[PDB]
Amino acid sequence: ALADISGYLDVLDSVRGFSYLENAREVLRSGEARCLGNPRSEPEYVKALYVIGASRIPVGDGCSHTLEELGVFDISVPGEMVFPSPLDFFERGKPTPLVRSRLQLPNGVRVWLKLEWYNPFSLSVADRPAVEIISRLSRRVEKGSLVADATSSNFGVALSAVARLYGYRARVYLPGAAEEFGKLLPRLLGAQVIVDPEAPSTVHLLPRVMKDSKNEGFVHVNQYYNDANFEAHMRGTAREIFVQSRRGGLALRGVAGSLGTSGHMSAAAFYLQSVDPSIRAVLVQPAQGDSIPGIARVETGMLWINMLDISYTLAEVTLEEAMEAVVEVARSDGLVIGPSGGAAVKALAKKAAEGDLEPGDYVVVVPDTGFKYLSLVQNALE
């Protein structure tokens, strides 16, 4: 028997840890789930179902239900694209587009681009964790409380818009080296913004944010460590790649992406590799000395990409190389991607060149629009 998952979403405030993901893998890999006689005695199972994008839960004595029955494959989007509010637009106006590129890689490696700038608040993938985190927050923390974090830019914008849509106040802390959209836009959206000229990276701002949190009593929402960030991309970004691939007729052989907190590619890889363990995750390691905005090297500390049981390969990519690739996707497809998108295109293009990859369809996740990166555009032309 099928019941609504919404009623049972207190498990989000009660399950901790990662042992619950064993349930996900089996349900995904099997393509079904066992009915629970007492949904409340199985909090691990129930959470797993939500995290894979189920909308309903299987309830009763001895039965099972498929992914389709559970609502993993439910179409959310109104065909007419009419939405009664922006937050409902983020939620229901999904998936983000999967576009097959005219870009041609060797060895029958077909490039598809998942355009995460089709998120309404930050025009970037960071919307998805921002809505998930703040939505759980709305359960506990009283309205008018100040919520805050460090960001390279996107999340700070996403946090500021979404905070204020939930009655919360926002503060964002940014490195001096972040772009002007990051420093400026949260202010337009009603946040405070703090820029540390001496912080060379977003991770290095973390102690300052924790220190001030202890002093002032704001809720440091902590995108690096907040399990909602991984979970949002499990039921959103990754699930979409699962569903789109299948509805698309794709022979999905891998994913390619970039790492900041590591939330989105950990989710894609884990979810996809639950379904089919051979699926490669090709991940970018920005080259040493170089800065690619929004992303970083793994060894600077990332929660999920280490701890979860995820097969991935790395490819080294310089800024200059991420910028070359922006330029060529612009000339191939007329679509203007961000630095970190080009980095992932490049990264896959190398594994493809090397002979390391099967022929078939790969999905790259493109985190944002290149329209926010005029300097790096300018410098890559001259």
Among residues 36 and 125, whose Cβ is nearest to ligand E1O?
125
The nearest distance, CB 149 to ligand E1O, in angstroms, is 7
> Binding of ligand E1O at residue 127 (CB under 6 A)?
no
User: 264: annotated binding-site residue?
Assistant: yes
What CA dihedral angle connects 371, 376, 377 and 382, to 10 degrees?
170
Q: Is 86 exposed, middle or buried (0-12, 13-18, 19+ CB in 10 A)?
A: middle
User: 257: annotated binding-site residue?
Assistant: no
User: 261: annotated binding-site residue?
Assistant: yes
> Binding of ligand E1O at residue 345 (CB under 6 A)?
no
User: 263: annotated binding-site residue?
Assistant: yes
Among residues 21 and 57, whose Cβ is nearest to ligand E1O?
21
- Angstrom distance (rounded) from CA 282 to CA 313: 5
DSSP summary character for residue 337: B
> Binding of ligand E1O at residue 95 (CB under 6 A)?
no
> Binding of ligand E1O at residue 237 (CB under 6 A)?
no
User: 19: annotated binding-site residue?
Assistant: no
Among residues 152 and 274, whose Cβ is nearest to ligand E1O?
152
> Binding of ligand E1O at residue 202 (CB under 6 A)?
yes
Evaluate whether 362 touches 348 at the Cβ level (below 8 Å): yes
List the one residue from 259, 284, 326, 363 that touches ligand E1O (CB under 6 A): 259
List the one residue from 114, 220, 235, 264 that touches ligand E1O (CB under 6 A): 264
Evaluate whether 168 touches 203 at the Cβ level (below 8 Å): no
Residue with tokens 């960071």: 126
Among residues 27 and 269, whose Cβ is nearest to ligand E1O?
269
> Binding of ligand E1O at residue 262 (CB under 6 A)?
yes
> Binding of ligand E1O at residue 285 (CB under 6 A)?
no
> Binding of ligand E1O at residue 260 (CB under 6 A)?
yes
6-11: long-range pairs with CB below 8 Å, 24+: 8/39, 8/40, 8/46, 8/57, 9/50, 11/43, 11/46, 11/47, 11/50
- Angstrom distance (rounded) from CA 104 to CA 109: 8
The nearest distance, CB 230 to ligand E1O, in angstroms, is 9
Residues linked to residue 148 through DSSP beta bridges, in sequence order:
171, 220
> Binding of ligand E1O at residue 191 (CB under 6 A)?
no
Evaluate whether 52 touches 24 at the Cβ level (below 8 Å): yes
- Angstrom distance (rounded) from CA 342 to CA 181: 19
Q: Is 140 exposed, middle or buried (0-12, 13-18, 19+ CB in 10 A)?
A: exposed
Q: Which stretch binds ligand E1O (CB under 6 A): 21-29, 151-159, 204-212, 308-316?
A: 151-159
Locate the DSSP E strands across 81-127: 98-104, 109-115
List the one residue from 258, 274, 285, 369 that touches ligand E1O (CB under 6 A): 258
The nearest distance, CB 263 to ligand E1O, in angstroms, is 4
Given the rule CB under 6 A, which residues bind ligand E1O?
124-126, 151-155, 202, 258-264, 294-295, 338, 340, 367-368
As annotated, the binding site for pyridoxal 5'-phosphate includes 154, 260-264, 340
